[PDB]
Design a protein around this ligand. Sequence first.
Ligand code: F3S
Length: 65
Amino acid sequence: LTIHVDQDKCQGHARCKALAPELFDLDDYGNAHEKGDGVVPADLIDKAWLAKSNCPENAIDITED
Ligand code: F3S
């Protein structure tokens, strides 16, 4: 599992960042992006799917391999 935020879809709700601070960083304009790895650790797999479910703009993709 990896995370991606589509920059064109992001409108900076910051829900992703409130749910999974560990997985997203916000730029100075409030837009989110995947952090370091992008790879989702075993303990954050659920917060990942939640952040994606919760984004109002459907801006988050999770890849599965
Ligand atoms: S709008 Fe952007 S800030 Fe997060 S909650 Fe969605 S990716």
